[PDB]
Amino acid sequence: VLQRRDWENPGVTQLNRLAAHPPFASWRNSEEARTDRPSQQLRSLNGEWRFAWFPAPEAVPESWLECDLPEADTVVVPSNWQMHGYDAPIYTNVTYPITVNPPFVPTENPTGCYSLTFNVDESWLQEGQTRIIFDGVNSAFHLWCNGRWVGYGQDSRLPSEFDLSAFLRAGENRLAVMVLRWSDGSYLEDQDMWRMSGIFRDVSLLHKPTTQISDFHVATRFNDDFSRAVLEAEVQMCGELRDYLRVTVSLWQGETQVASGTAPFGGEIIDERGGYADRVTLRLNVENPKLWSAEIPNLYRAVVELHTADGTLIEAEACDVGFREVRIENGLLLLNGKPLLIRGVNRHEHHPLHGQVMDEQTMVQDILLMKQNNFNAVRCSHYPNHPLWYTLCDRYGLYVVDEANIETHGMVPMNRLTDDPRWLPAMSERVTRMVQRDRNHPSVIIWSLGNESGHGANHDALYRWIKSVDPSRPVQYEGGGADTTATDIICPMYARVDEDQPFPAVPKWSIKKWLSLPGETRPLILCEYAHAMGNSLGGFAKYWQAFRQYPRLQGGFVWDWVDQSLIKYDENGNPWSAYGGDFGDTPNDRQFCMNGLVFADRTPHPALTEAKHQQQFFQFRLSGQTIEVTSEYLFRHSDNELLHWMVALDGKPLASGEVPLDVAPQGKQLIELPELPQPESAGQLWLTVRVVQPNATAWSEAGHISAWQQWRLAENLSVTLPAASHAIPHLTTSEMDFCIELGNKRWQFNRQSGFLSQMWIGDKKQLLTPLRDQFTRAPLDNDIGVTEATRIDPNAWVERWKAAGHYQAEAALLQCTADTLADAVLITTAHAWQHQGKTLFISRKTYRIDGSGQMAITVDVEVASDTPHPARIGLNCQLAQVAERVNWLGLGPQENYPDRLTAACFDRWDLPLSDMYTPYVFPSENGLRCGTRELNYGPHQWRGDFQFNISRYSQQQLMETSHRHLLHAEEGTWLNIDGFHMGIGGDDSWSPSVSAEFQLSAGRYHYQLVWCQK
Amino acid sequence: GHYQAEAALLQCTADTLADAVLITTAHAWQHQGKTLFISRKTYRIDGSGQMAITVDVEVASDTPHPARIGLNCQLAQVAERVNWLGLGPQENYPDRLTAACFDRWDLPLSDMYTPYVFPSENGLRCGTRELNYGPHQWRGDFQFNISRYSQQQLMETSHRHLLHAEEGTWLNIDGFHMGIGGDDSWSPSVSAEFQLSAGRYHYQLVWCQK
Ligand SMILES: CC(C)S[C@@H]1O[C@H](CO)[C@H](O)[C@H](O)[C@H]1O
Ligand SMILES: [Mg+2]
């Protein structure tokens, strides 16, 4: 066993492991099978096991086989032993966490010894078969029962089952499991995620009778209009064949039995030697089947009864059946004859406290949030999931891409193993045993051959295997250029909408271009797009405009759902979010483990609302007073929807109403708005519509908003000249300052710096740091990319800004004058920002302080055309006051940026100061709000047309601090007011991704602000 | 009412600074009670004889995007040559300027007019940083056309041969000019990125004599 290193042999992936099959429970009562109640024949060993850690399997004491080690501790199972602290979890993206020397792994190979002492009743051993099921063991294990070696298993993400019948005794038994962290299986498990280990999914014991249902497959086929279906059920048995044996497959809609078939064993002739005597195929007619989709997840219950002709039950198995057809026709992916639009997300199995152990609550939380945010699909990135996931997807309604546990990203080249026939056996089992397990789940609509393993001949073989075995689902795979002979769907990752990326051998064409390449006919659905790392999803709207305009652009899966951050604790025992390198793990890929739409605790990032808005199922158009509503449902009518509409003048409500929605799938409804009264006062009328769900569903609460849109209506421009003031501001001059006085107010301009350095209301300072131009931002993850101090990526935005001296450019004064006017004082300034003799930016300003106390600031900036376009053009200052609330007229309520503001609505928003900061785990520029006409904070009011963020954290602190938990609130409030701000990008996070129309390239910029007190 | 809108003065003030005079104006263009455009300008005249013009325009969001945002006047001078640092030498528009090259161009006045058989706005040059004509020089970042025909005559005249040189020279200087389109000529064809929809517009000029 130590002799024979099976964990270093890709030719050995298991020993004595039983055949894979769909979920079993071996009910002995038909009614219990029908209702899906617990089964007495299926026991959970999810309790406290004994555990001990060793640096290598050579260090495991032989005594551990027969007896418990006193050194061992008592730990919860399922678990990852890294989450218990026995050794460290490693975060690496591409580079393998071990030396690349297949089939070999390190001699120092962390070994987890699990054991359990448990009871078996005599009744389980008198007759029949007792098997143990390990749903998940990472990454390879040897199993012993009562001292005796049972078997061995690889593949971390599929159940391993072993017959214990001959090993057990009635009463006290002991299981011993030696789990190896590293194996030859690790070479095929190089997914971009925390590398962990252990018995991390359910362990169970299953009792089956000797004469048993050993396998069953459910197929549903349809006539052209889906008014007729045949359910075909192939059922296999093990045990001794007998003439009196029968199978009954019955189909149920709730408590109504809809169809039933009974036959003895003995299939039709197959070839010259006969048929399968151990198999039967039952076929049931179903008239006007209720069809399954993510829109309406209609399910039936199939009960599979093995019994005698006279009617004694032997055992029953069961599954949920969803009637649906998935096919590709004329280059379109069809579900029930209708072209899908995939509103998808990739989802890793990750919990911040429990690692890679999944639980029902977290699973359900995820589904609810997904459906609540207009997602209809999920990709199992990048392995078969916990078996309950598929059940939940079946029941709530989500389309699933089921993906084999094969990723060889770190090989050179990427297909070095997948093109090697010696690795085909190992690969084949990871595909075959997934299909055998999951093939009865209606939620699974597409099979995937794995991820980032290049394109090798093994892919082509395994592609064809699934096509033979299961014609009911398309097979996709992205490796080796996303349009190879091993995929039914063009499935690129991070291909852009309009921009080609012509990498040699594996180009990523513009998705619109890819579709029409000579000879290309297939549908395109991105397996990964819109990399949601930190402040991201810039340009998301561009994808959806394209998905909606192009039939064959059928959507994609966002990368990804949830940040893979883990909880650590400080000296005060306070929790914080950790990423790569925070466990002494090295090499690592730092914050790249965090790419989620939600935080690890399932709190949303601002990007989620942008995804919800773009993935809406109702589209809107306005013509005069008529709203046109178009449904993008393919199957359901809008029978739990009403349209609320509201017209407001600069945030002030003027009229509202509601109209029920009554839209056929793909249909249109016209809504004529009543005559709206004219406003007296100036300003812009805005129309906002919202789709509300009056009733609760299985996935949402009463009053849930599923869609919205906004339009500008009439605008009445202000022509009224403000009331003339009788006071006139007084200018006081010193060598160091221009001071302006008006009533209880004072303004101070430093003549050496050229900036407003202080402001007084009554006697009190308003500024802690003078008002100064700013052209930089604390860099986003998209700005940073894959650059490092030891290995600069000169193409990354941050590195371009640094090398050009944007971050260390010092303001030099060119002009500072003061003129007294009739009813105002005018300060005129000019500055140059230079780096090593090169003039980067020029800023020319006037400040006009009139008798009404208002300060008008006009700013005109020049940006050298050959310097990298700047992150922002605006001002910043540190205010002295900390106020409770922030009130603004502009886009909100949530964080929004120029290329991620479609979700935001224009209105009057009022939030606590803390909501104006986004707690990204890796800190950066954040909390900006665009299209803002008025900002209110304490006694201050700023007016104009600007973008702003406001918080207790300076841009400097944000860029200097690598974790949110190390941030400290600074004195006062940092205000950044921008005339212009660069896009955030996110098409990917390892190359510049900000689109040209969102780069600040205009050369000359102008903005104006009015600063006053209310 | 774009063609018949009349200016209504909102503000006209003068200020003496240390080495300059500043004129501040604001106008509203209106049609039937509706305000289409607001123009706020400053004119800063210094000791060097330069007049700096700042222009800030508001366009009502429910009025159709205007063809241009600029200034015009009829100059008394008739000069032989037009000299400019900008895109040329030929007529060019925002959606048709890729062929034009940035350089120093010098043409006879009649080359700054394009004799389309059916007369319309014509002879614009974009991306112009400096324009010279007779005793005048304009600097900034603007589009212009210059000819002996007013926009009014061009629009009222159906055939090129019926046009007559007006007294002096008509100068149109635009901070912004709408695309010309052409995908077809029977439905609107100016693409959205070339429509003047920004709502608020800024441009600046310096008028002087060399
Ligand atoms: C060139 C590398 C950045 S590969 C890139 O890394 C990402 C990091 O989140 C994801 O894992 C993507 O799937 C992968 O293609
Ligand atoms: Mg092996």
Ligand SMILES: [Mg+2]
């Ligand atoms: Mg990878």
Ligand code: NA
């Ligand atoms: Na489409």
Ligand code: NA
């Ligand atoms: Na990642």
Ligand code: NA
């Ligand atoms: Na930082």
Ligand code: NA
């Ligand atoms: Na004409």
